[PDB]
TrEMBL record, chains A, B:
Mn(2+) 3 binds at D249. Signal peptide: none annotated. The keyword Metal-binding applies. Zn(2+) 6 binds at D249. Zn(2+) 4 binds at D101, D169. Its cofactor is Mg(2+). The chain holds residues 65 to 422 of 425 of the full protein. This is Farnesyl diphosphate synthase. Zn(2+) 7 binds at D249, D253. Zn(2+) 9 binds at D249, D267.
Amino acid sequence: ASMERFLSVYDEVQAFLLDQLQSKYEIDPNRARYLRIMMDTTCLGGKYFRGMTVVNVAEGFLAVTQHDEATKERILHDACVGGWMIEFLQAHYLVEDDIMDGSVMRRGKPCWYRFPGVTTQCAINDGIILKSWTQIMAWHYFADRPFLKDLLCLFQKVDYATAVGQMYDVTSMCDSNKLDPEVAQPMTTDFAEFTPAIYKRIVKYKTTFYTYLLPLVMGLLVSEAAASVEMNLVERVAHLIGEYFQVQDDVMDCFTPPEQLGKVGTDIEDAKCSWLAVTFLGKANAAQVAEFKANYGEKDPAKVAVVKRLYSKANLQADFAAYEAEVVREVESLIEQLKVKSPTFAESVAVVWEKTHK
Amino acid sequence: ASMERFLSVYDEVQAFLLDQLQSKYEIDPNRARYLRIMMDTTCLGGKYFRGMTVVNVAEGFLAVTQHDEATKERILHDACVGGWMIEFLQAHYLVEDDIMDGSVMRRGKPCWYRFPGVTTQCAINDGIILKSWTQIMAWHYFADRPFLKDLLCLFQKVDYATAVGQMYDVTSMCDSNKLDPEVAQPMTTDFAEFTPAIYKRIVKYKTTFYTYLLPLVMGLLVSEAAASVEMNLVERVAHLIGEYFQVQDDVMDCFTPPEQLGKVGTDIEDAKCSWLAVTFLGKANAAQVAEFKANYGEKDPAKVAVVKRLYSKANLQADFAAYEAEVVREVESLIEQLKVKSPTFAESVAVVWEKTHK
Ligand SMILES: [Mn+2]
Ligand SMILES: [Mn+2]
Ligand SMILES: [Mn+2]
Ligand SMILES: [Mn+2]
């Protein structure tokens, strides 16, 4: 099974990293144990969607390409390692974003920095280590691979894009013209920057590059198949599926009970430029906009309840269904275009869409 | 002048980074301005010792190697860019370490995260961007260079080592056997881990790799001269000079007035494994150790004053002078050994020592 190989490689990668800390970085056993627990707590327990996308893309090409058995095994091992690079990159983001946002829970468990023996003082550095481990992995496992340079270059550009996206995200409730390191940032009062275009830019950089583009292209690279596809189509379809992913996340933040969500959603309190706020402001009458402005972005539970009420009364299910229908058209169109050069890869993308959509 | 070229390249690198944000990352002008101010505030204003070491090593080899003039200029430009990679890496560390430690000032100015329009929520991500910029620089300026892979590999291993060193540093006041993410960490009461060996491990990883080893080897790489030297000697001498650097920093933290230091030193309050504490515990009688334990690691100003008194009464100037004399012997010995294969590089190391020592 794909999952079974993927999880076995985690054990191998963990052992390599911790053994190297002992043999080359002079680490002692208690700190090795701390880092092992940190790695498990921050990297394990999700769905491994991103990492497994690398594996699944690679498996698709193995099914139609002649290889020695040892080569099949090496490609699958490379896909697993590259998948864990992305999972560790996500772990880095989640650790640091939870600190930056003051989040409380993540996947039914306390955020890493809130563990009693961690604290922010250690957790910021723990998140730095998680990202450094992605590079240690690559240089060790891919040292002699022909895709090493392309993979490292891709990884770093996606990582940079994601940090730029985090800036877009955490500043999305400020007026751009008032941004200034010397002046404490007030929340917007006109919400003029709550537009579809601006929302799409947040999501594209914050989410879609590392969640959809990177796993797909990494699967191509470890398969030596990047010339088998039109890269502009891979970008466009990743952008599309990633945006749909984030729209779903945004809806759930407001409307999924905390036990199922795994956290208490705070997008309203945090004044996020979410799909609900943008779409509501694309629909609302004057009265409703005024009420939204009077209540959005405040921890006060009665104000949050007014915003959720406005959202419920706004029939945003209709907008979501129409958004979803348009995304189905465009994603299907792009999958069709991908078949011109690689039916195999087009099928992998169809699977990524089906897992995202349904 | 070397400094004049180095600072000119900053302007060039800044322009490249910000222009690329506009042309490829969809940035708007106010956020470009924020990032420009962030870059200037976090990267400028120090001595540029690390960055200029790259330049000076490269200049040493230019003086004795035949090159076309355009090649001399390209090598110096590469040395400047590689120097700014290290300066931006340091900027990353300082931003994140100041947040992790709750520091107040850095170089006579508030720490970046304490700017009113920054906040920890933005500053953690700003520090992430600073490090991502080091990689954007390398891939853009060194794309076709033969040293690209060696440089990237070196940079990432030094970066990893530094994060491991930060872990050693911020955990240095806890008993290793009690380290545990599930349990809030108490300060040591026996100080058994305040030893020269353990202190040297903190310093080696936290400081010496990125402050001394990386600039020296980067200067070799951009000069295509790494085979001109014995790398084990470069490591040993970097370790030695870097440790002396940190010992000086530790003394100043306790004894240099804040205006000259640029901050209010808090190593005693923070219970740091500093050279003063280790050396004091290497000298003290039972009575003095007991008093140290009763007062170390507490913000209470009268307790800090008791520790400073113990340090003053302990005649640690004698230990420092004897430490310094031994470092002079060993550094001179290693410079002599370096002359066997490269007098030019040995001279660059002598300059790095002279700037550190005097
Ligand atoms: Mn966030
Ligand atoms: Mn969300
Ligand atoms: Mn620190
Ligand atoms: Mn210090």
